[model samples]
Target chain A: ELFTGVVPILVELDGDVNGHKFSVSGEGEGDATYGKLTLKFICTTGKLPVPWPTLVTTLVQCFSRYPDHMKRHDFFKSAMPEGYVQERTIFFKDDGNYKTRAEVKFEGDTLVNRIELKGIDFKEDGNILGHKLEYNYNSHNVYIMADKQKNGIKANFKIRHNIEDGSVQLADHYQQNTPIGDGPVLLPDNHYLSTQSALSKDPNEKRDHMVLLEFVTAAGI
Target chain B: ELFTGVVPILVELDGDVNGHKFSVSGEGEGDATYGKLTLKFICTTGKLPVPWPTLVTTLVQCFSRYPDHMKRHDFFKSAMPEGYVQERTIFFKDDGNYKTRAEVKFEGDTLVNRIELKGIDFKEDGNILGHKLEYNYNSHNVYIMADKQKNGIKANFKIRHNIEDGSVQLADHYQQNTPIGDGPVLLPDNHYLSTQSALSKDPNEKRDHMVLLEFVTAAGI
Candidate 1:
């Protein structure tokens, strides 16, 4: 049987940055690669709410990955150093016999300190996954892990965006927790965030294996 | 008499990053303050076009300023790095008996290496501004000069986005022609880059003094 799932996240910039009233928002989604994130945004007209150039990039980046969408997950971890707050809803669907509706509130440190997930699965007309996670912030960044790992599948991954010199590095790693044999490889080398390698077929791989993704901001200055 | 000007520029991204087919575009315009460029984008949907991020910012920043109603300076300085191409039609109206139409093309260096301003105007059916500037990009940046200072005015300005960190610095310097005083106050904010110090009252003040705009990509990251 084929179980199809759709996960969507949207961010709205309803306020102003300096004094310019601004209205801009972004969105993201995924099921195949739940660990990756990107934030996409644009304003064809009207006053820009922010006062700086990076702030615009930062905000756009903020909404594009992990939880946002667009940009690269590379900017995910570092972009929100001051942290951010997001109130959102997530959904999952499995053919005709399964479905999940979760209303989530993501708030706290730029590291994604806490996540509140509350929802119901209508397939079996039961409560599938609902819990709050207070993730640890450190060398190995763990923002928030939502959804279920039951039946050998779970939504577990780490994201980090770092820039130094002139390189824009995105550390997008997926943490797998499948049963045994060869489970599907979540990530391949075909994406915007440059990756020279793909996942392994060895089901014996470490449960917390990490994948690295890369991109450059500019060359010289 | 006040000469109100409107400048607009657009950048389209047609590429895919990761698994998402991305399409992102941006547009910008400005009034008096020229140095500050804002990139306004949105997507409450949860997905962003890949092909580019800053290019959208760069495009919006390009159209954000200038006497665009006249010049074919669509390829404004700082709009692209590998350089970009844009085409548009310009128009002007006066009392119903006056009208001007022009077709222009902008292409070249990310630093705005060249521009083509070709068009026609008529009061009693006349011709006004038409000149293509082959700009020389150096430390202190100088791009297109549009509209009239109006009073004793000469040329107005329209700016765009291009990056080279420090080289990304705007000269923010205005040339003094009339000459009463303030002369020039070049910003060395030496950071991300805007401040809201309006135009001066010195009739003798240098016409194009520059203002440095500032914004952050994130925080401590």
Candidate 2:
């Protein structure tokens, strides 16, 4: 057998996101400036009874198309066997905690089995932004409103995949119904936000609102 | 900053080994057949204070050049700090166990610090070959002499990196002074052996002796 035991494989993804804006009043806009996004994780795979070359080709094709697959809401479904299921959980302050699960069933025996962990901040303080922020809502918009007690706007974002089993945990994600900048809402540095509009006035603001998604998995033979 | 945390990154490699053979008494030969080789492991990196795009470019360039670098003996020296140190360990059943290390120190503050695990077999059997073999001595030949009591020639070679601290671990590796086939020596299946002669007679024999080298690292920010 080419793959005789549980193997741990690392998967990393990097992409460029165009700066864009969201607007509750009008159509949002995208800017020329592009922001960087990255996700790193480990996935384990059980024994695969295929040739080494075949396995390599399969993995390369699978990962190379990850972005497109994710956009289609069928991450890894095409490359996996029938009856594959994935459960994901997200934790946030307040009532933002929730779960999302996906499953696909086919007709053949499962060739590979895997599990993944959610993305976690790798910082020593275990936070993505330098300051604490809370989820808030107003008549016109929802916000990751700033903590008035913080001092600076400097921020950072990183995803750490702690080697574990059982369930997949995802990073805290936020979305906005309209564009940022030119509004009175409080925003923290480096906080990621999703917008409906593809255009933004300040590309830097759009960049700060971009999200990074990563999956880490350990598989068995 | 894009990369602020001491992140663990998984790196996987898969390649095709064209079937070929060695001739101890004459010119070696190569065949059209191809064998499979794969290496998977994790590497940790300390805080990289650069934008994500820059770091991604650096890593992609470094790994994409790994094959050429091995042929040049400067693996990762160029992408690392000027004074980076790498110490490797290899263990075999006989006197074959050995150590090899490399270091490169340069002018800038070290941005990434990492340590790796040596490759180990993940199988419960904990062996590359099913049958016991010994290193033997001969006039015009060196051999991995087969144990007389063994039954079949079936073999397998895999490199596993056990998570550890301090030093780098390398899988047991072997090299032949000359080619195999058309000789009076014993051979095992899935045993990795290297030869200066790139050509071989029975490509299947050559495929059986291909090696898999992997590096597992944990870096600090």
Candidate 3:
């Protein structure tokens, strides 16, 4: 039965980007019209460069775009894209005020090649209860090269996030010019990788390092 | 707004129930009336005693009871109970035919003390895609002793799951009597542990090893 109203959804992302392993997993709810989600991101090697603000912004944009993509092309029906291109603009707002903006470029519809965030105030934006968040990108020109094959998607990119907030200033950080690499970095073919989506059936399922994404609808009252 | 109809909910459980650490996390949706969830349960030490059929049955019972507990006492509003008691029966069914049954006992309302599964058929129940699910408990008297404090819930119990199903026959396996321990195994106080719940946001949030749980409502459509 098709669910109505606000329904819960779980989103999980795991695998490597440029030999740096990361996983993002959490639970949230939304209706057929609108939704919200929360999750945690951990880098296995402790060397991931994406800051908390950037990571949060990226995720918000991704999910916000998901419904549109699905409606336009039924993207989740199967694995069909090895390479595709997409573009979108995302606005981050807090208390009816726009706090930040991101321009995202994608490859294969699932992989991100560039994400540029503007008007960021680390002290006032993207702060959680326990951890102090910071953002310091070498340049606004963040490059993400992802290879999606049958097994799973493997990717490599450069982004930065630090645990302390006052360590860097946004104006000076974005001024420096970082050289854009020739192309996306590729990992060894033998390395382990995976990506998939499913409807959740149990609340206590074990998910250690796998990238898992879930969706539940709120209908049929 | 309070969600109505089927809502999306995320359930996460992490921490050691004994020296063996386990985490169960996933996403599912439920309405004010009914819901469903799916999750993955992983034991970090690779030595948990609860089997697949037993685990699934236990979780189904837990979530199924959650709503009742909340309605009766507003259980999620805060942490107040250090020790409490509960008893429940869970039925596992396939196409309306009851497949298995579980009798569960709890301590502190959040900690499971004992779980007994009957009418289990390894061949016909609890099979996943990639892994061969197996259940082998030395005794039906599964003992779970959990300590709940300000930090997190710490527990120690013995349950078993194996990679192969046909390796050990269930009829003979349950015939053996393993000694029931004196009491719940107590862990060192300084060991790291945590337990909490929240509404999920940001699908790409990272959760490395912390025990996390979430709930989301589907309403206001």
TM-score of each: 0.22, 0.21, 0.25
lDDT tens readout by residue for model 1, A1-221: 00023334444444322223444444444222223233333331254322211122122112212322332223222323333333332222220111112112223221122222222332332111111111110112122222233322223223222222212222233322222223322221112221111111112423222111111121110
Where's the lowest-lDDT run of ten residues in candidate 3 chain B?
Answer: B190-199
Evaluated on chain B only, what are the TM-scores of all the candidate structures, in order?
A: 0.25, 0.19, 0.27
- Per-residue lDDT tens digits for candidate 1, residues B1-221, read 01133333333433222233433333333332233332322221235322121111122223222333322232222222322233222232220111111112233311221222222332332111111111111111122222224111111222221222212212122211121123221111111111111110122323311111111111011
lDDT of 3 by residue, A1-221 (tens): 12233434443434232233454544454333322222333344343333344444333222222243233222211122232122223222220111222222223323232322223222333432123433212211122222334222222222223334223222212111111232332222221111112111233334332122322211111
Q: Which candidate number maximizes TM-score?
A: 3
lDDT of 1 at A89: 25
lDDT of each: 0.24, 0.21, 0.27
Docking class of 2: incorrect
* Native-referenced Cα lDDT, model 3: 0.27
Residue-level lDDT for B48 in candidate 1: 38
Chain A TM-scores, one per candidate? Answer: 0.26, 0.19, 0.27
TM-score: model 1 vs. ground truth: 0.22
Instruction: Pick the winner on lDDT between candidates 1 and 2.
Output: 1
